[PDB]
Amino acid sequence: EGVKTDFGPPYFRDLLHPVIAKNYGKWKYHEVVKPGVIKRVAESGDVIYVVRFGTPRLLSIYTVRELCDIADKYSDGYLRWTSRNNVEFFVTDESKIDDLINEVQERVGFPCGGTWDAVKGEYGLSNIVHTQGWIHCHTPAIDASGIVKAVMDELYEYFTDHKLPAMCRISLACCANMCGAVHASDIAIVGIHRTPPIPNDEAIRKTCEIPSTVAACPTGALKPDMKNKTIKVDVEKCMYCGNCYTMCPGMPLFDPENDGAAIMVGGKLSEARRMPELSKVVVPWVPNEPPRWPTLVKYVKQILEAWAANANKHERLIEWVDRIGWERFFELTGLEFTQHLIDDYRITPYFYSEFRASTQFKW
Amino acid sequence: EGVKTDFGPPYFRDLLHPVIAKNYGKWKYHEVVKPGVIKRVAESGDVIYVVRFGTPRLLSIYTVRELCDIADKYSDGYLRWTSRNNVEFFVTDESKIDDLINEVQERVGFPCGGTWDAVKGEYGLSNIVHTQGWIHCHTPAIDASGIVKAVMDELYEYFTDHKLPAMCRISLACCANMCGAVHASDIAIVGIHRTPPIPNDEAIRKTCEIPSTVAACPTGALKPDMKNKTIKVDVEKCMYCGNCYTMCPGMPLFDPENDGAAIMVGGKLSEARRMPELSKVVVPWVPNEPPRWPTLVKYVKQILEAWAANANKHERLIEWVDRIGWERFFELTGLEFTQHLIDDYRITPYFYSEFRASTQFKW
Amino acid sequence: SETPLLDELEKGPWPSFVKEIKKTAELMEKAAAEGKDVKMPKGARGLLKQLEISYKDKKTHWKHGGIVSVVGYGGGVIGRYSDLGEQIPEVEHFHTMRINQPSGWFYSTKALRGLCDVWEKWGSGLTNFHGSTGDIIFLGTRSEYLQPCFEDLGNLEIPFDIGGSGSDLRTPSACMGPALCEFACYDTLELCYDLTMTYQDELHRPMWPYKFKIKCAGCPNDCVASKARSDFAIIGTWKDDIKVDQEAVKEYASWMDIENEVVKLCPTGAIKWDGKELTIDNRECVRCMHCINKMPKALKPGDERGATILIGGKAPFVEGAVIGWVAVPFVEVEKPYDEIKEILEAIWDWWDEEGKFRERIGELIWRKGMREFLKVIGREADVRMVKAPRNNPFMFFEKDELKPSAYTEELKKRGMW
Amino acid sequence: SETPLLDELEKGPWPSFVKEIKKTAELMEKAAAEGKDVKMPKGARGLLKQLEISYKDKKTHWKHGGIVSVVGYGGGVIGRYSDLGEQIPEVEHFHTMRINQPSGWFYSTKALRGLCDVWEKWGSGLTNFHGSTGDIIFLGTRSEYLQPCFEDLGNLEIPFDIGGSGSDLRTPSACMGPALCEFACYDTLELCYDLTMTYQDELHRPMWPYKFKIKCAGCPNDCVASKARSDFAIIGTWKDDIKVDQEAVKEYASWMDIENEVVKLCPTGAIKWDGKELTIDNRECVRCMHCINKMPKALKPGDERGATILIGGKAPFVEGAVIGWVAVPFVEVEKPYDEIKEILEAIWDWWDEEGKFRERIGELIWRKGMREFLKVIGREADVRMVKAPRNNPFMFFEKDELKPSAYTEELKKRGMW
């Protein structure tokens, strides 16, 4: 016998809603009824209603069972999540759509919304993709779950409606190794340090493999100390990425007062209208202010409300910038351009800017 | 007393034709009358005609003496050269313009032309900026004067008339340190090596400062060899740039059978309509074939004719590509894309792609 | 008030995570007091008390992880310890388990309940739905519980395996694709699972110089952020014409501003509308999706389907953040996917043989060059791989491309060349 | 024939450089035969012969040169020696003297006649009009003749000094500017001349880590290729409105297609035409010049004039070819140009202090960062310096910007900060 291994996840096809299983790869068109409700008509003529809700991502198993109770009812015991950590139900009988929407709100407190209609041209804010934060991670500069709650509270109304002229993605990373699509979002919140690491010589000797710690620094600020058998850090060359702390517990760069978040904009993943773009820093640093992070929230709101105001139907934030330029962008958003925003990261090769970072090309 | 030094060039203002000195900074407008001939009208009412002629750049003083005789006869003893090495005369009596053109043509064999007219949107091909080649330089891969002569013979009709729909600059660099603005030219001819150097240890030891020879290598292919007090080359990392031979006579890499020219396109210097751009390689290599370099000339002409045949008015090569894309560019020019054309020059920083290399910005 | 700073975040309209954590501990302690087989009832409370301290301190309270796994596997379990280990005993070990999600995150209620049963028993009762990569996150358990927990997950009527972590093939993910989406150019969910199954060993037993991720997107809309979030982004596309029902477009133009909201927005001017006919120049089309996005009833992807493969996508670490670039312009997606597998394996053989410690595939290509990368996958250089040809003449030439000469014979004579 | 390969280049319509060399040979030989004081009657014919052997071998026959100069100067004369010196002794020494051009290449015939007489006497009789930087090139003389040639030059009725070469300020150059051009935003010729005179020492006596180039363009058309070919590109611009003559625009509207040739080609859509009234949104205009270029009788640069300065322009070596980027969005250009001279001297000091052997200014800025560069020239960062802000979060913060913290004190009493 022995403990069975190497069997993988369940086969997805066994976990499909019957109407979905039958009409697989055979749909005619979709239709957004109202915000949070999307209709899908099959080539067979069958009609199923997908219904989307915001989740905190982090779920109690009890808030899981309680979703399964709802699932058996409105949706034949079938269910799914999204790529942005929303939850979607599948209702056949369209009279029981609102019942679902209401029961969900009273049972678990999960708002209906998170959708968008490109056809008409009206968009809603979807969930924020984020990570662990102080809940579980050993190298964060900020905490995801908290800021997410604080931001979405302010910008709730946007998730619930289609009040936006184009698609806006808000995403978050708790440190520089930027987990999630954070480097490619319309608005990004990125945990940064602003303080170099003070080496712990004792902790390094016993635990740290030095040569790979030294090799993992992108600016070369680290040099092996032969003596001594420790690491030396050139403060002039450190930009507080904290990669050395990832590699070595003897290299903390943590300072509660100076750690914070940068805000980046102008990212894009889809091909539609224009090419994918990496996010760009437009606010160097805002403080950690648990629990409401009011400075962060105000600056995200400020930015989003600026682009919302000006942007033409479909025109995303980076597309807006394409049109007005960064000169007018910094004015309207009311942000200041400092030297911190001039790229100085030496190691990335120029030739990457010449590669096709897109599926867009002619045959 | 002692030898006079530090006195500089003659003050230009004492060398300006009286009508030009009088109306300095007081021009109404210019009109391109016909190829080679530009009318300039001053606010004062003075009218001067600037008549332009192609030159081989390498001039005989006896040619300079001839041009002086002509200048005394038609332009009151005044003359200039242009920034692409054409020569210009200043005629006030409009009824003498053709006497001049014909007399220049006859006496020195220099053709009138090398102009363009933005207003009507009709453009001449001007002179090819080029350097020393085998005439005087020790680091060339190709000749300069031979290739320019061979290209200008084939493209001559475009020098004397306004036959092209936009500006086309053709520029030649006899090696990779591209003396000239060859690196931002609509069509650039750039000499290259394809063979690594063979260290001559005796010559290196005698004449070369090792550390600066080593550090002149962009790919880090050179290492000092303490034992034999010389340099070792890692052939795997050498891309035959020639820089180490610029530094050190003990590092030649010339191979007369494998030296040749790359052909690059899509450079733009002016701001007009779109930003400046560095030229991009589209033919990796063509051989030196003196005296006519037929293979090189055939490709330059092939590229020019394809752009001319499809380009809209004003639309320079890079603007033509902005429109059609590189896929259609290689098809229309009949050129092959190979892996050579995928940029691999590692040292150049990505952040330079993010700097505003241009005077276009909003106030 | 035990937790004054966290309680501020139970307020507001957005679903509170603080509410989620409280809801867990309270019911887990309610279960354990009722004689239930709960090994960690104290888990979620201690987590809340530590997070409360972290909010006060404005710093993490988790230290570096002493490595841990299950029998047979090397990855899938991430070790974590609290530096308040003695003050809050129950979070001295709070290890995460990554549970392989079903392709496209589809679930029946049973499957989910099964997961809850095992985790209530062996863990903190705290989960993430879903993790960034796509895995189900079992958040917080001890070292000697890992082994029994894995036994039982596999013995469930709907059984789940462990996902990928460390220097392995990570758990692949895929957009909803053909399960829900009329845009799908191929069966994303089948491809995701098939891959997950084919390279089980490379997922569970990390052997590579670093991590490697794969994400499958139905169409160029990239609904799983594949180009940014994976080393190997398999994105759906087509070769022939966008299928256009002309009457359906008239149904749009009855109300829609097709000239402004569609025509003028097409990147390459390929799409025309005059009032009667819509015309698409598929030679000029870059299959950006917008027009199909705009008029999904009317417009559709072509019949000749497959995928473009974008290589390199990664977060910034070491050499810089990467949105994947074009590696394979077109490849067929048909079971058992031999053409895609052949590619993946060739890349892995090469990356294992040549990759430095903690070097991502994209950094390796950057270091080695596309020429080497292309010969490894056995494909030709193609203009579609670049936004533009190189802006400098510093090209490497292969030995065999050179004209034989006095000079090459000299190089030969000395054993260089 | 003596030169069958070069003879081929006496054919064809383009004026022949071979004819130029041969003419020199014939007439220098004739002049010397006539008793005229000509020290190098054979130099031209030696060059020709070496060039013919070069065409046959497809390689240079020049070697690395010895250092050579005129008394008092360390630059401006570049030694060149042939490897064919025994076979052709008249070209064994064949150095170039770079003679500083008048601003904008303006001459009277008396000036040129002076140059021709001096070079006839002491040199090959071969010249370039002009060197790529701008200088007159005296192509080919022996070492013993450099000094007496320079002396003769300096004693001419219209005298000519040596330009630059080596690690110095090279000979600045200027487009024609206000002498002929209605587009000029400043006096290019005057500025050029003034910098040349002001920094004679920096030009004649190389003292820097490498070469430094200045070029002066009167307007954004950049007719001296300054941004590609000079480390410090002074490019004319304006701050206020384009001057529009409406009646003149109507005179254009009668024959010229303004919508297609002007309106649709403006990079920012700032210029509108409705059939009666031309409008310019100068808040949207980026001063690209196309509209003015299209309509010089109607449109003029604005009244508040000066220059944008572009920094770093260079050929590839070391770190890549550079088109220069915005260092100074706007500076006034008024005699005696104190603001420009200030910027220059600050840059030079800093570069002399920090530069490596053979490091260009552009490369130093890439190495030290724009922050250090901007403080050196005492100016604030401007959004006009970048095409976009940084695509990564790895930002350096200065000490004074950080909050006073237990950590900042811990750093202080450790010898770091």
Ligand code: SRM
């Ligand atoms: C729900 C979800 C499917 C899934 O879970 O697998 C999804 C679903 C669809 N996406 Fe998406 N997208 C989903 C992830 C995305 C995200 C990826 C991400 O953020 O992680 C974006 C890429 C972000 C980016 O580009 O930076 C994405 C790029 C798009 C684009 C956006 C249009 C644009 O202008 O860029 C299309 C176009 C559209 O609006 O119809 C699109 C269109 C669609 C369509 C309309 C396709 C269809 O006809 O069914 C699907 C309906 C959703 C809707 O609200 O209209 N979907 N798609 C996605 C999860 C996010 C969520 O819960 O809100």
Ligand code: SRM
């Ligand atoms: C005489 C000369 C300046 C000098 O001091 O010597 C010059 C003079 C003029 N240039 Fe220029 N440019 C001169 C080299 C250049 C070069 C620099 C170079 O090629 O090395 C270019 C920059 C090249 C580039 O853009 O890549 C240059 C880019 C322009 C532009 C841009 C054209 C465009 O469409 O991008 C204008 C616009 C125009 O066409 O009227 C221009 C326009 C002009 C105007 C029309 C301005 C005026 O109001 O008189 C002048 C007459 C040119 C004509 O033939 O129409 N000039 N101009 C130049 C000698 C060139 C020759 O013999 O052919």
Ligand code: SRM
């Ligand atoms: C589990 C997860 C957090 C979450 O719940 O969202 C995670 C969390 C950690 N990541 Fe990650 N990464 C998670 C998805 C990502 C993604 C997004 C994705 O995979 O779709 C990225 C960007 C894409 C990429 O891989 O480049 C990402 C980029 C990183 C980086 C490495 C990036 C690089 O430049 O090479 C760090 C650094 C490292 O690996 O040492 C890292 C490493 C880590 C470590 C082990 C922290 C560390 O520095 O040692 C994390 C463990 C904390 C913990 O115990 O939970 N993680 N990480 C994410 C996966 C959930 C899942 O399994 O489904």
Ligand code: SRM
């Ligand atoms: C004379 C001239 C060629 C011509 O016929 O026009 C010239 C000729 C030489 N150049 Fe140059 N360059 C000439 C203008 C340029 C220009 C353009 C300009 O000045 O407008 C450039 C590009 C801008 C720049 O400087 O980057 C240029 C970029 C170079 C490069 C190095 C640039 C770099 O850092 O990459 C080399 C290599 C070096 O500096 O050692 C170089 C070096 C040389 C050497 C000394 C050859 C060598 O490898 O050491 C030249 C010897 C010629 C000879 O012996 O007869 N030359 N060179 C040009 C100057 C004459 C004049 O005074 O007007």
Ligand code: SF4
């Ligand atoms: S982004 Fe950083 S802090 Fe957040 S989960 Fe990833 S590694 Fe941890």
Ligand code: SF4
């Ligand atoms: S924080 Fe980053 S830059 Fe500083 S020493 Fe550590 S790895 Fe290097």
Ligand code: SF4
């Ligand atoms: S481009 Fe090269 S070969 Fe030509 S003169 Fe300049 S350095 Fe010499």
Ligand code: SF4
């Ligand atoms: S030729 Fe260029 S790449 Fe090769 S060793 Fe010399 S400097 Fe380096």
Ligand code: SF4
């Ligand atoms: S990527 Fe394409 S097929 Fe997949 S869900 Fe998004 S729009 Fe549909």
Ligand code: SF4
């Ligand atoms: S898919 Fe995009 S590029 Fe193609 S026709 Fe439609 S809008 Fe244009």
Ligand code: SF4
């Ligand atoms: S740079 Fe401007 S001012 Fe100078 S000649 Fe050219 S168009 Fe006239």
Ligand code: SF4
């Ligand atoms: S100068 Fe250029 S940007 Fe300004 S209005 Fe004219 S064409 Fe437009």
